[PDB]
Each structure stands twice: as structure tokens, then as C-alpha cells.
Amino acid sequence: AHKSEVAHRFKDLGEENFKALVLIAFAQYLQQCPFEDHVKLVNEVTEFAKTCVADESAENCDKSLHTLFGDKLCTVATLRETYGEMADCCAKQEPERNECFLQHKDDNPNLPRLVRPEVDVMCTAFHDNEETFLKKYLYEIARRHPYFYAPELLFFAKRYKAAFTECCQAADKAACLLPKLDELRDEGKASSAKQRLKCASLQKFGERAFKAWAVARLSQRFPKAEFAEVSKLVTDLTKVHTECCHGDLLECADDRADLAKYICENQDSISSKLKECCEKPLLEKSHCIAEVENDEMPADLPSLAADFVESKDVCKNYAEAKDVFLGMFLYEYARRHPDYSVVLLLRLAKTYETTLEKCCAAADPHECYAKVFDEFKPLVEEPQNLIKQNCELFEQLGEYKFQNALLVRYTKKVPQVSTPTLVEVSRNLGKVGSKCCKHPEAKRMPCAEDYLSVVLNQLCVLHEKTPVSDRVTKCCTESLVNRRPCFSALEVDETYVPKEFNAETFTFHADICTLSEKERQIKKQTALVELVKHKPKATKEQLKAVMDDFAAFVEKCCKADDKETCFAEEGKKLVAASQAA
Numbered sequence: 294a295h296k297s298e299v300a301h302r303f304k305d306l307g308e309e310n311f312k313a314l315v316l317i318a319f320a321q322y323l324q325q326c327p328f329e330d331h332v333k334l335v336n337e338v339t340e341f342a343k344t345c346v347a348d349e350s351a352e353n354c355d356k357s358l359h360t361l362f363g364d365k366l367c368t369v370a371t372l373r374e375t376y377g378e379m380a381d382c383c384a385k386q387e388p389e390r391n392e393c394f395l396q397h398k399d400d401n402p403n404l405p406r407l408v409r410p411e412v413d414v415m416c417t418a419f420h421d422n423e424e425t426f427l428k429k430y431l432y433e434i435a436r437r438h439p440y441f442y443a444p445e446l447l448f449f450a451k452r453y454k455a456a457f458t459e460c461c462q463a464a465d466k467a468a469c470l471l472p473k474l475d476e477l478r479d480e481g482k483a484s485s486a487k488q489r490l491k492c493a494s495l496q497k498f499g500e501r502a503f504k505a506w507a508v509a510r511l512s513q514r515f516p517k518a519e520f521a522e523v524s525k526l527v528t529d530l531t532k533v534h535t536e537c538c539h540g541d542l543l544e545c546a547d548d549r550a551d552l553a554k555y556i557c558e559n560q561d562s563i564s565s566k567l568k569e570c571c572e573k574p575l576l577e578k579s580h581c582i583a584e585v586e587n588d589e590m591p592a593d594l595p596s597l598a599a600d601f602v603e604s605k606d607v608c609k610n611y612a613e614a615k616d617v618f619l620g621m622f623l624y625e626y627a628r629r630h631p632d633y634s635v636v637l638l639l640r641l642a643k644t645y646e647t648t649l650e651k652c653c654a655a656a657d658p659h660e661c662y663a664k665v666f667d668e669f670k671p672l673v674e675e676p677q678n679l680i681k682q683n684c685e686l687f688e689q690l691g692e693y694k695f696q697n698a699l700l701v702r703y704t705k706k707v708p709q710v711s712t713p714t715l716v717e718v719s720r721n722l723g724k725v726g727s728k729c730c731k732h733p734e735a736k737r738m739p740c741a742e743d744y745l746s747v748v749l750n751q752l753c754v755l756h757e758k759t760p761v762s763d764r765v766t767k768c769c770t771e772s773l774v775n776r777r778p779c780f781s782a783l784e785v786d787e788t789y790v791p792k793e794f795n796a797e798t799f800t801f802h803a804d805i806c807t808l809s810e811k812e813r814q815i816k817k818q819t820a821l822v823e824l825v826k827h828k829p830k831a832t833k834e835q836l837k838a839v840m841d842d843f844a845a846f847v848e849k850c851c852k853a854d855d856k857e858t859c860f861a862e863e864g865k866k867l868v869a870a871s872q873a874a
């Protein structure tokens with residue numbers, strides 16, 4: 294119990310780290326305020342922290358972190374006219390103020406995308422003003438992702454600064470930044486999606502779900518570790534992720550640094566893969582710890598049968614300590630199956646706990662729990678088969694064609710959801726195909742299924758804001774590990790009334806082909822989703838031929854003049870073909 298815990302966080306983290314963390318927290322909490330106001334509040338907070346470090350016996354720096362942030366934050370957000378539904382939260386009292394600030398986070402705010410000015414002007418601005426430029430970048434990226442992982446964003450800002458200092462000073466400006474900027478953008482999107490998955494799992498399913506997930510992941514990653522060390526590590530990791538997902542960025546980063554230090558200080562007791570890159574500094578060290586590859590398998594392990602199935606008092610020990618028994622079973626099973634996906638292990642553990650809860654408090658317990666392992670056969674067979682045929686389809690269809698197939702399939706599964714979110718989710722679902730299908734079958738399943746869970750959680754999050762689909766919210770809320778089997782087993786929504794025909798959405802303009810290739814891809818996919826929504830009963834071949842003709846026509850008479858005639862009467866042929874179907 295350190296007096297003035299703000300001073301403790303300040304001395305543990307550092308001046309620059311504290312500035313970046315408080316700026317990220319302010320930007321995430323308040324996504325509408327201008328950058329200058331956030332800078333002013335950050336400066337006031339850091340000056341106050343400096344003063345209380347100088348004198349920890351101050352009158353009012355004994356205030357708690359949540360209370361201090363709320364009081365120093367909503368004094369400028371009090372403007373009802375300027376913002377609207379933002380000042381109401383702090384009118385109440387703690388801890389409800391922090392909770393209200395938490396639920397008010399907007400996952401998809403109405404914000405313009407990055408403009409990406411010219412390389413030379415950005416590098417000159419970096420040279421003229423470095424810290425302000427990094428602050429602006431952090432503020433923008435935090436606003437566009439309210440649930441991003443703060444220490445990871447610190448590392449990303451470090452890499453951004455390193456790239457600017459290192460390359461743009463050279464003669465070539467756009468030769469190096471653009472690939473680097475693309476790589477960091479992709480990594481940031483992946484990390485944001487993963488952290489949103491973690492936070493959503495935490496908030497919507499309590500302690501046990503995240504604890505089991507992290508136990509399974511760490512056991513898969515660290516086979517050589519004993520169960521006590523694994524339990525300590527998962528407890529600390531769950532504490533860290535709870536702290537970040539609840540807006541306590543300071544202590545979350547401090548705890549993550551402490552956890553990384555503890556892991557790198559006990560390498561022999563967990564894994565040997567950490568030795569190669571524990572030497573690099575704390576941010577990059579934690580970057581290693583986040584994504585260190587699986588440690589080598591120990592030899593001559595027990596076949597899981599002498600204690601979990603053949604035990605004469607298996608669920609006696611289960612009843613003695615339910616959580617401990619489930620943790621032991623999940624850890625042991627994840628030891629022998631590194632190729633198994635994390636969600637698969639969670640489902641198998643759920644099946645095992647259901648079996649023990651169901652059929653050993655009876656006359657013949659062993660007669661039930663002796664053959665529980667055959668129940669695992671379909672649970673592991675179906676996802677492997679699904680991924681196998683999906684990768685076989687992708688390898689022949691190609692990127693854009695797999696995207697088309699996925700959009701068609703998901704729009705047939707649930708057309709109630711709005712077009713843009715479905716387009717983006719299915720675009721990510723097409724991206725995972727190129728991301729993981731190239732891997733061998735040993736590593737094909739884990740990464741693919743994990744990214745599928747991430748994208749499905751993204752769909753659930755973008756759907757909960759405007760719930761319009763019963764089935765989607767139904768199996769986004771009823772279970773987390775069962776989301777992929779739900780969306781895999783969903784059928785065509787026959788009850789849905791086909792959307793009324795609207796020829797305006799098929800109007801064309803030269804901006805289709807005079808703009809970038811990507812925007813053309815999204816526009817064509819959006820038109821595809823709209824047409825599928827209009828006629829869900831249409832077959833794959835009909836849609837494919839129609840859109841091939843669409844692209845052929847668009848390129849054919851946009852590459853030349855006479856756009857007005859194309860639009861006007863080839864729209865008549867468009868509607869005629871739609872009638873002909």
C-alpha cells in the first residue's frame with residue numbers, strides 16, 4: 294500500500310512512458326475532443342504527478358487513480374452542447390463513473406480514415422517536431438481503436454519513431470516508408486482485433502472463461518512448465534488483461550513489465566525459446582513473450598488415462614476442487630496436443646466437465662466416464678474437415694473468388710445484418726484464407742481457427758450496437774467457444790423476406806474505375822451483398838456470371854468515353870437481366 298500510487302506508477306514507468314500511457318487513456322476515453330485539449334490535460338496530469346513525486350505528502354494526490362482521471366478528465370467534457378451524451382457519466386459517483394465511461398466506448402466511431410500525406414512533408418514535420426508528431430499519432434490511433442492494447446501501442450509508437458529516424462533521412466522517401474507503414478498497419482489491425490477479442494471475452498464471460506483460455510494457450514506454448522508455475526503465470530496474465538480491458542492502463546503496463554521480467558528471470562522453469570530474445574529491452578522483450586513460438590515437446594508423457602478416466606475416484610477429486618481439476622485437465626490435454634486449437638481444447642474441456650457433472654453421481658459412474666474420449670472424436674474431426682475443404686476451395690478459387698464465395702455464403706446465412714459490416718467481416722474471413730491455408734496441416738488448424746474466432750467476435754461486436762439479427766446475437770451471446778460451430782451450422786434464412794428491388798444502388802459512375810483498386814473491390818462486394826440480399830434464392834453460378842458481366846462492362850466502357858450512355862441504357866439492360874435472373 295504505497296502512498297500516492299500515482300507516484301509509484303510514475304517512478305516505475307518513466308516520464309515518456311507515463312506521457313504516452315495517459316495520452317492513450319485520454320484518447321480512448323474521449324474520442325471526440327480535439328488533440329490540443331488532450332495535450333493540455335496530459336500536461337496537467339503529468340505536472341501534478343511530478344509535483345506529488347517531489348512531495349508525496351501533498352493534500353490531494355492521495356486521490357485514487359480512477360477518481361483522479363475522472364476529475365481531471367470530465368471537467369473539459371462537461372460541455373453538453375459540444376459533445377452530447379458524454380458529460381453524464383461523471384455526474385454520478387464512483388465507481389459508477391468509471392463504469393459509465395467504460396460502456397460509452399464506441400467500437401466504430403464515425404471518424405474519417407487516414408489521409409496519409411506525402412512522405413517528404415511527414416518526414417520534415419517529424420524533423421521539426423518529433424514528440425508532438427508521435428503524440429498526434431498515438432492520439433489518432435487510440436481514437437480509432439478504443440480497446441487497443443496500451444503497451445503494444447507503446448511498442449508500435451517506438452517502431453514508428455525508429456522508422457522515421459532511420460530511413461526518411463535518406464535520399465529515397467517513399468521507397469521504404471510505404472512497405473513499413475503497410476506492415477505496421479497490418480500488425481496494428483491484427484493486434485487490435487486480438488485485444489478486442491480478449492476484452493470482449495473478459496467482460497462478457499467473467500473470470501473463468503479467460504482463465505481457461507489463457508491456461509490452454511500457455512500450456513500449449515510452454516509444455517515444460519509445471520502446473521504451479523502455469524497457474525501463477527495465468528493468474529498474473531489475467532490480472533494484466535483485466536487491468537487493461539477496464540481502462541487502468543498505468544498499472545496494467547506496470548504489471549505487464551513485471552510479468553515479463555519474472556518470465557525472463559525463470560527461463561529454465563518454463564521454456565528455452567525465450568533465451569534468444571530476453572536480452573532486448575522491455576517493450577521488445579514483452580513483444581517476444583507475447584508471440585514466442587511453441588517450446589519443444591517433452592518425451593515419454595503419460596497417456597492421460599491412468600488418472601483422468603481410469604481413476605477409481607476421479608470425480609471425487611473433481612468435487613474436492615472443481616476449478617483445480619478442470620485446470621489440471623486442460624493443462625495436461627494441451628500438453629500433448631500443440632496442434633489442437635485453443636478453442637478446440639476449451640470445447641473438449643467443457644464436454645469433459647459436462648460429463649463429470651452429469652454421470653458420476655449415480656449407481657455406475659465408471660460405466661459412463663470410462664468412454665468419454667469417443668465424445669472428443671466429432672469435436673476434433675469436424676473443424677479439421679471444415680478447414681481442410683475450405684483451404685482446398687481457396688487454393689483453387691483464389692483471393693477475390695474466395696471473398697465472393699464467403700460473402701455469398703454469409704449473406705445467405707444471415708441477410709438481416711447491414712451491408713458494410715458484413716462486407717468487412719467477410720473480407721477478413723477471406724484474408725484468413727491467404728493467412729493460414731499456406732501453412733502445413735500441422736499448423737493449419739490453430740492459427741486459422743483462432744483468427745476465425747477473432748473475426749466472428751468482430752462481427753458480434755459490430756452487431757451488438759444495432760442488433761437486428763436474432764440468430765447472430767443468439768449464438769454470439771449464448772457461448773463464446775461455440776460461435777464457430779454456430780456460424781458453420783447455420784442454414785439459409787428462409788424466414789427472411791427478400792429485400793425490395795432498388796435500381797439506384799446499381800447506378801454507376803467513373804469513380805468506380807478511376808479510384809484505387811481496393812475501393813473498387815469493396816464497392817463491387819457491396820453491390821454483390823445488396824443483390825444477394827435482394828434475391829437470396831439465387832445460385833452461385835448465376836451470381837458469378839452476373840458479376841463477371843458487371844466487371845467486364847464497367848472496365849469495357851469506362852476505359853473509354855461515352856459514360857453517360859453506358860449508365861443510362863445499360864442500366865436498363867441491368868434491370869432486364871435482374872428480371873431474367
Ligand SMILES: O=C(O)c1ccccc1O
Pocket residue numbers: 434438449474477478479480481482485
Ligand atoms: O501503424 C498503423 O498504421 C496502425 C493502425 C491502426 C492501429 C495501430 C497501428 O499501429
Ligand SMILES: O=C(O)c1ccccc1O
Pocket residue numbers: 530549552553579580582583
Ligand atoms: O507479456 C506478457 O506478459 C504476455 C504474455 C502472454 C500474452 C500476452 C502478454 O502481453
Ligand SMILES: O=C(O)c1ccccc1O
Pocket residue numbers: 679680683699722723725726741745780781
Ligand atoms: O466458413 C467458415 O467458417 C470458414 C472456415 C475456414 C476458413 C474461413 C472461414 O470463413
